[PDB]
Amino acid sequence: MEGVRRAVAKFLRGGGVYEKAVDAFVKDLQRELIKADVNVKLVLNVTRRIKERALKEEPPPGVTRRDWMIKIVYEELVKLFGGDQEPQVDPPKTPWIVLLVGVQGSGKTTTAGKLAYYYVRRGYKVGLVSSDTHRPGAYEQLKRLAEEAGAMFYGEREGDPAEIARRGLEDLLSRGAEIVIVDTAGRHGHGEEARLLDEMKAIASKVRPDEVALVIDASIGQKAMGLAERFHKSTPIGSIIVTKMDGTARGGGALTAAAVTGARIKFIGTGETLGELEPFAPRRFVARILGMGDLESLLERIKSLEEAGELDRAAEDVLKGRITMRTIYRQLRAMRKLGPLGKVLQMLPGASMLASIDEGALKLGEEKMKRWMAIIESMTYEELDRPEIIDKRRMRRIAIGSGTSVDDVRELLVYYKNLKTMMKKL
Numbered sequence: 001m002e003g004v005r006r007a008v009a010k011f012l013r014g015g016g017v018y019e020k021a022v023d024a025f026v027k028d029l030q031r032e033l034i035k036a037d038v039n040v041k042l043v044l045n046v047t048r049r050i051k052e053r054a055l056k057e058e059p060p061p062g063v064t065r066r067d068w069m070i071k072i073v074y075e076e077l078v079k080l081f082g083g084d085q086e087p088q089v090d091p092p093k094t095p096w097i098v099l100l101v102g103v104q105g106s107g108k109t110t111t112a113g114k115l116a117y118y119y120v121r122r123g124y125k126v127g128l129v130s131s132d133t134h135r136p137g138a139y140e141q142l143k144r145l146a147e148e149a150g151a152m153f154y155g156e157r158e159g160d161p162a163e164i165a166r167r168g169l170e171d172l173l174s175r176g177a178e179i180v181i182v183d184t185a186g187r188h189g190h191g192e193e194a195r196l197l198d199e200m201k202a203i204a205s206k207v208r209p210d211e212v213a214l215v216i217d218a219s220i221g222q223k224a225m226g227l228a229e230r231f232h233k234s235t236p237i238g239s240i241i242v243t244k245m246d247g248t249a250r251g252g253g254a255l256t257a258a259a260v261t262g263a264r265i266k267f268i269g270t271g272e273t274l275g276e277l278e279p280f281a282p283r284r285f286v287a288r289i290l291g292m293g294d295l296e297s298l299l300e301r302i303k304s305l306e307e308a309g310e311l312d313r314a315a316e317d318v319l320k321g322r323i324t325m326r327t328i329y330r331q332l333r334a335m336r337k338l339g340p341l342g343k344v345l346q347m348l349p350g351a352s353m354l355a356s357i358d359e360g361a362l363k364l365g366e367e368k369m370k371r372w373m374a375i376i377e378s379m380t381y382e383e384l385d386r387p388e389i390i391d392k393r394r395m396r397r398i399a400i401g402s403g404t405s406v407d408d409v410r411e412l413l414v415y416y417k418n419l420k421t422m423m424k425k426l
């Protein structure tokens with residue numbers, strides 16, 4: 001979906017009345033999701049998640065209205081596309097048996113090859129297994145991709161598919177396969193789909209798969225609900241892999257099947273070559289939809305401002321004479337993740353004037369701030385409150401706990417006192 005990029009760009013720039021830009025942006029986005037099918041119910045949910053946040057949350061001090069709204073559209077689109085932060089690209093355990101399931105034509109055998117390569121390159125010993133008995137040239141197809149992918153192979157063109165699959169499993173485990181992908185039929189002869197289901201369930205029983213992956217094409221927006229229910233009944237789905245995300249695209253049906261089985265989309269099929277297969281990371285995918293350039297610019301543009309806001313309070317809290325070890329600790333943290341301060345977009349009330357009294361207040365090194373932070377972390381809660389209590393014995397104890405000089409804990413201490421003096425005026 002490419003119109004959505006243009007919408008973000010119109011919204012982010014092409015000004016006019018703010019609220020008219022957001023009603024229009026929500027409108028564009030909604031049209032754009034529907035065009036990618038998705039599911040009206042899933043589209044009216046994402047817009048309500050966005051409204052609720054827009055009503056309860058307000059841009060943090062300094063952040064523009066628009067920057068904050070895209071940050072809300074992104075985060076909630078991420079949730080819509082699963083994206084609960086769960087990539088899980090490596091299997092969690094030693095031998096990992098993957099049963100592919102799906103209807104013929106969707107890209108199952110291609111996905112088997114693409115999937116074998118992917119794990120080979122990540123340094124896994126991969127075997128493929130041809131269980132498909134009904135499609136002619138299945139054995140040979142998988143054969144090609146297995147050597148093409150640099151993965152071991154085992155198949156039989158004829159027999160009980162369950163026993164072919166059990167045999168291919170044993171063969172490849174014997175030859176030290178750490179991952180085994182079991183390719184399957186997507187049609188039982190003419191098109192008796194209910195013999196196909198009983199075949200998957202039987203293969204599954206003999207094989208004991210660690211992950212049943214449903215392989216689906218990005219061309220069943222509305223029909224993705226049913227397909228998933230049928231396959232989920234026979235072999236409970238644990239993965240979804242979405243094929244044919246090239247040329248004329250779709251995909252919104254993916255996250256309908258995602259919903260029905262409660263299964264994650266682990267891999268996207270984006271072409272015809274072995275190589276054309278990358279994991280599905282929602283954070284990154286929606287970022288591409290929204291416009292990867294803008295979106296990452298906008299999230300930093302916000303995080304800078306939230307940093308400067310901490311420095312704002314830290315400088316302000318000094319200038320109102322409220323300086324403490326907790327103020328300085330928050331001040332250093334803020335200064336550290338920021339850099340050598342600003343000049344282009346300094347834009348700070350406190351920090352401007354703070355440096356305009358003592359230049360050497362906002363001119364500490366990285367290391368000098370990092371040592372001072374370690375120091376504060378080693379002071380007692382009573383010391384944090386009353387640093388004047390810190391005699392020679394304490395000064396010493398502090399130096400040990402934080403790997404520093406008894407004179408270092410003096411430098412901070414003076415800094416504290418020296419800052420505190422100035423803001424008393426004359």
Ligand SMILES: Nc1nc2c(ncn2[C@@H]2O[C@H](COP(=O)(O)OP(=O)(O)O)[C@@H](O)[C@H]2O)c(=O)[nH]1
Nearest residue numbers: 104105106107108109110243244246269270271
């Ligand atoms: N464009 C594109 N084509 C694909 C993709 N995955 C599979 N195909 C094609 O889908 C067709 C059916 O492939 P196959 O793997 O035989 O499907 P199966 O019956 O489920 O095994 C072939 O023409 C493949 O080249 C993909 O990610 N993108």
Ligand SMILES: [Mg+2]
Nearest residue numbers: 108109132135
């Ligand atoms: Mg096939």
